[PDB]
Amino acid sequence: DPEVTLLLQCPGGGLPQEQIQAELSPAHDRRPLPGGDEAITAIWETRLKAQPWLFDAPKFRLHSATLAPIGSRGPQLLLRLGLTSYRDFLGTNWSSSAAWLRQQGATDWGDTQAYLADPLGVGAALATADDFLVFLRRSRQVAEAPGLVDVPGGHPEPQDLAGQLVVHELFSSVLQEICDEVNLPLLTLSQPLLLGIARNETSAGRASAEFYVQCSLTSEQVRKHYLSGGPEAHESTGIFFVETQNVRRLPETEMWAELCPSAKGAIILYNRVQGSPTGAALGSPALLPPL
């Protein structure tokens, strides 16, 4: 799967909010382009002169994420974050020249991402009370990954002593994206666990935080809530469900070729961190079938 790379696999079945620190610093921002940020401005101007209803928005930038030694007490993860924007994304990661910016970053800074916006996404492996994961079909008319399968999520917009508010907004935003797109009540959702971070190599290495969220409703009830919004209540064109039993072998199915890279990230991390039992009971051959 060359279109997805794992940057972080979380320990202990995934990390709760209270075990994560963030450092939000201009030291973690994109570097100005070698010939100046005028190239980003020119692309934006061309875009607005064709689609003048478009608007810019701020985004978090992932610089890096450092895990503590396993088995330790105290904070278990440090997220190094800067700030970027939708405009900077359109002029760098989404640019036809994105691979040239990666080579220049290697040359100038020893960092393939130095000249990339790299806005941080969020996504969820969302499980039902009857043990299914939730999938969404993307419109065939959108610019990114048309007609492919996705999981719930988005790209959160800003607003340890400003850090804890930032971690709070990241955990909040994955629940908000589930309530807005799937139309579920907030009180049917668990507190999220962070499974890990996955990079989209088809979009020049931009990264998504991937979470595990449990719903107290069954697959049939989740479908009812999704549909009862009507076609205007969601960006996706349909919802469907796969037994957690069958998610284990999903990369061997015809569905895999239809998953967008960030949804592949969410399913690989679910299989590694929530699947793959470590103990004698769940590891027994009748509960963990060979092959």
Ligand SMILES: O=C(c1ccc2snnc2c1)N1CCOCC1
């Ligand atoms: O939701 C998104 C979107 C896509 C990529 C990124 S990367 N940073 N934030 C993003 C936001 N879009 C694009 C514009 O039209 C509506 C759908």
